[PDB]
Amino acid sequence: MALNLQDKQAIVAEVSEVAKGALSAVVADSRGVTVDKMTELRKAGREAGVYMRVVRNTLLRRAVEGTPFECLKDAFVGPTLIAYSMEHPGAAARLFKEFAKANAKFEVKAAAFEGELIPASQIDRLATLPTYEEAIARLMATMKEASAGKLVRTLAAVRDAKE
């Protein structure tokens, strides 16, 4: 390894991943396998890429004090063990899902998904931007408007009505 220089390197780099980054995912790893790297980086074969990195930098006073790059409310995002996930390129889309449906396979622990930056806030796992390039989902979000919402309710009765 090395000294405070190596530190500064690791931090300025990994938090540059939080400066120019597309998204952020904070995950506590206990019983974290090699099949984990063989999960996120296998999903990096045909879907993701080298555009993704997850380092365990929960070294904290390194990776936290190392955010003059302005990650706030993150002291609370520093408890216990955490594996930082940052995306420089691509959409912020799929990565959140990769972990979301990783940990539910029991896949280590999710830290209850403590939440991370670009909302810049606390813990809840939302559906915001898995759904893009899915815009067929919007093709069905129109719900046909005048037609399918009509064949749901305006024609509901004749099947549900005679009684």
């Binding site: 399918a148 305006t154 005679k162």
Partner: peptide, 30 residues
């Protein structure tokens, strides 16, 4: 057409006809 016309018809339109109508309109699209 005025909404009240479509509503009046599709509401009344008998029964013996109507259940073979609106159901068929559920058998065309969706």
């Amino acid at each position: 057409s005025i909404t009240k016309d479509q509503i009046i018809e599709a509401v009344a339109a008998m029964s013996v006809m109507d259940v073979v109508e609106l159901i068929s309109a559920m058998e065309e699209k969706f």
